[PDB]
Amino acid sequence: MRIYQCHFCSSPCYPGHGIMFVRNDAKEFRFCRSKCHKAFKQRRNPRKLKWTKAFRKAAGKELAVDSTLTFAQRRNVPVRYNRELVATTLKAMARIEEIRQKRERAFYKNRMRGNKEKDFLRDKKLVESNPELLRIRE
Amino acid sequence: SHRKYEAPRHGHLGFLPRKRAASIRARVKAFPKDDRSKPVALTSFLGYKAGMTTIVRDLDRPGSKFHKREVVEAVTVVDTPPVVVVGVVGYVETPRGLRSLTTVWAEHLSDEVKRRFYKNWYKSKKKAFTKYSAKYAQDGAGIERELARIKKYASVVRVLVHTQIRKTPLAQKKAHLAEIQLNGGSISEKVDWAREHFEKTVAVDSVFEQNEMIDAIAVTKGHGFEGVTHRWGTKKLPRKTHRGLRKVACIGAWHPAHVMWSVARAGQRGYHSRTSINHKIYRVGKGDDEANGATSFDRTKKTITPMGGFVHYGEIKNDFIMVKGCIPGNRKRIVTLRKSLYTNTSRKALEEVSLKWIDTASKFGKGRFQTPAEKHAFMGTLKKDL
Amino acid sequence: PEILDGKNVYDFLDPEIAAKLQALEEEEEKLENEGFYNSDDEEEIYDGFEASEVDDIKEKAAWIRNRQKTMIAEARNRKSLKNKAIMPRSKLT
Amino acid sequence: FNSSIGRTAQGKEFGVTKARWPAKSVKFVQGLLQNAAANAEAKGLDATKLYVSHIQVNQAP
């Protein structure tokens, strides 16, 4: 078994889902669902589509580089399948997932910080410019 | 006239007439050989279809080119909550076929089966078993007489059982009565085992098990009045034929001067009871065990139920049976599970099905995640979170 | 196991997992103590705007938005100018 | 006169599966019944005991 990352969205592609394309260049492209496959068939650029992870990574909407992401790699060199190592990896994956979620939440908070001041300023502008409405209200 | 060409007849002639079934419950026709050398056990069970899903299985079929490979395949999920015995029937052989001698009911019955005996239940006084219950007690004799009569003259014993509909997500609230022939020990042993189970419940793992082969018997999907083209697969006329093109053009010869019954006229399609055999059970589930959809090759504590629930069906929440292939009937339909009916010894039956991974992605669309945790990890925090 | 909730184990399975996990724990401790996860931002601050004043301003802004939306809906429903002209108020009683 | 008439579940009351709702005929029949009841009341008959013993309909020009 192997979950594949969508070429157009990087989303996990579980077995028996989506469509795969093989070109004369002797490489394979996997699409999670028909939407991504149709978008690719139109020669669209994922970096210019807002609903694909490529744009978010390029646009900086989410943490693009982090230390946690270094754990996940294509292990071209296998391991001898030690029983203790299996349990250690099982615990480490959960710990890394929790840490990555915390870091992503922190990054989102840092990106969204300051919206409160803008909202307060907009409310002040709306209140100041509508005296008659307030007078009629009370 | 030999028509210069030979073609197979459209549609099997054995499945006629193609009329609607008289009941949504597909009555079982024949039970297994009923060899009395084995312990008493049930021969069938009642379940409700709960959609389907995909399975990846490490095929160990020797000789095949998929030996030791990983093959993805479809599996159907049927909601099979525990079943409760509510009576027994004693059958006596007669020259005119098997005949029902007498029926004995339990001491008390749940409202689910009492409801099955009324069509205006909310207007009904609910007098289901007012006198029969009174006859059961105060002597312990009237029922015992019926039990002795059954023991004396009966040949095959059938247990009256009904599904716990209230446990299922269906809003039906009505149970389905069915007769299940008792196999195993002598008829006296059969009735003794059934008698001790009055008002009790029977699980599903005691009847079926992993790697077991079962036969699916249920009413197929209804489609109403259908043209011959789809009803029997008749080829379409070229284009714009006079008086229609989607119908069989020639119906018969001058001699005979009548339309032959086998000329495949248009009519009702679907809703016909059908029997399928050689269905291998892939997994037996329990409602009290967490991580029903987990596997030794997955480790994920997730239920078989897809994200957001099934389509047109609720959450399993009970015991369920996983079977490969497709089973007749649509979702949330009563389907009766029956044994293979014969001493199957094919390698497919002997094969051990150890699931590698179970698909629990949402069936509501192009699901990309197996559990909400994966979706949260991928998408991350959203605006609504803060 | 070969699989987990996601990001299959074979991608994480590598020698010396414990050392890298300890390094990640050290990195996390280098941030929790420094206040990187500043989740205690439960109160804002402005140029002397007290809680009552800001709350009143927010409520007034919300009411103004609701009134503007209601007026937009009323104008859209009443106008119907796309088909015919509105009656003259002068002649109406 | 029920040739090729559609089926209705309301026919179970009278057994016959074919039934209809002839609104105009029903209106005329109830008007005639009201006239008959008025005539009976004028005569002095007891309305409670009244029942339609005879009713005849035949084609007109």
Add this chain to the structure above:
Amino acid sequence: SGNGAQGTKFRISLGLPVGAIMNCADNSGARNLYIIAVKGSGSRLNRLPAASLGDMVMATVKKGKPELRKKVMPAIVVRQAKSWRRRDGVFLYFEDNAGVIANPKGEMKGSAITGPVGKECADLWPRVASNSGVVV
């Protein structure tokens, strides 16, 4: 299955019916192939014989070196260009449908094959795999 097959054939979608044009994938000099019939197919009323990945078909070269034209020889399809069910659980399809020409014994006319070669064809035909520099 014809001679040269070393195993059972998987059930896959029919991509090339009779008369379908498939590009060549060998250095034999041919450029396109015209399918006239499919070996091992059970003919039925109204049903045009159709091939698939790994199938052996009889075709006549339409374009390329004239020496190979007007003669019919067995050909093996290396690319289908129509989605087919792979047992690994992926609905994969190729960019362009293509085939190669070989004798009934399975020996490849061309010394080498160009471009991707389907797994279900290389596995079933040892000679195709040996003469193919790319698989999948």
Add this chain to the structure above:
RNA sequence: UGUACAACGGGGUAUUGUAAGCAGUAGAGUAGCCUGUUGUUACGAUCUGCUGAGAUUAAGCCUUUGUUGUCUGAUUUGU
């Protein structure tokens, strides 16, 4: 007259794709005042941040610790 039913509402799962409005030392370039040589103030398709935002969600999707409403309308049946 209660794990009772129905209309809404809250969530889960999906579809699409970043809504109105605001601000920008982004914005090919063209104009008033002035006096540059990042002048400023105007027009400016687009782009940037609020904003994976906005909208729909069963008419044959799952759930409902909430709000409102409903629960004696006619006929027939006898060994």
Add this chain to the structure above:
RNA sequence: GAAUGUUACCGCAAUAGUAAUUGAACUUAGUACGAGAGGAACAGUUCAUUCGGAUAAUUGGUUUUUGCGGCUGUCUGAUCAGGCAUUGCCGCGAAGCUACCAUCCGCUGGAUUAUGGCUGAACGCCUCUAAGUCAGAAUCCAUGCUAGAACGCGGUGAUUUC
């Protein structure tokens, strides 16, 4: 669908129809056979061709979900938000429907045709037949499945004080 004392549930089956079909692949085995060329049985195991019954798990196809976005002419003073262009057009598109264009499944007992026999006279031998009888076909009858006689049948619960 009336009449079967009423309704309801669970059942038997008189009867009618009937289905599976064919080739390939491993082992047998490069073994018996064969001077060489070449080259098999049986049993066991694995797929596919045609046909039949299901079903949307995955993928393909449809868009009136007019669900979500964009595009042109025109109109509401402008923005927003909207009407018409016979479903305006374009992209995606769930639910629904459906495709060897996608998936699953399609049992095994008796009696027989030709054929091999056993015993055994006719004919003081012989005989496969005259009696009896052992087996032997995709055949016939059965197992199974489809419908259930609306005037075929059985069991069970309730059976209206007012």
Add this chain to the structure above:
RNA sequence: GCAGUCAAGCGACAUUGCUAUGUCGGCUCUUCCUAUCAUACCGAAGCAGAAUUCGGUAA
């Protein structure tokens, strides 16, 4: 067929040389027959294997 040939019976079998004047055809459909092309089961053929010929029931 022509012209012979001998001969059990009242002429069988064997035997001698050569030797289109009409309109029906095709797509779908159901059923039936065997005078069996293929599939099941068998016998005889120079069947050593492989391949093949004929014959018997079987639609």
Add this chain to the structure above:
RNA sequence: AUAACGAGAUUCCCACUGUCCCUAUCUA
């Protein structure tokens, strides 16, 4: 007593397409 032109008769090539393989879905 042969140019152009053609709702004139017939043959062939590119694109094309549900005529077909094999049919399926929608709208009034």
Add this chain to the structure above:
RNA sequence: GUGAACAGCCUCUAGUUGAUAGAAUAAUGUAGAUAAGGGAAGUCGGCAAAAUAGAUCCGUAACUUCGGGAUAAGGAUUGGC
């Protein structure tokens, strides 16, 4: 108004709401469409459908009664500011 156009569509002045209708969207039809791979393998026969369609620029063969073929054929562009 858009558009070369009284081609096609919307709008103003003016004139109409007249075609029996209520409920459902079964088969089959009438009118209009979409479709994975092949692209005529279907059919008596490319019957029907489809495909290019306006404008700007390059280029345009055989024949010829030199007037035509010709928009031959085949190629590049089309929005907004």
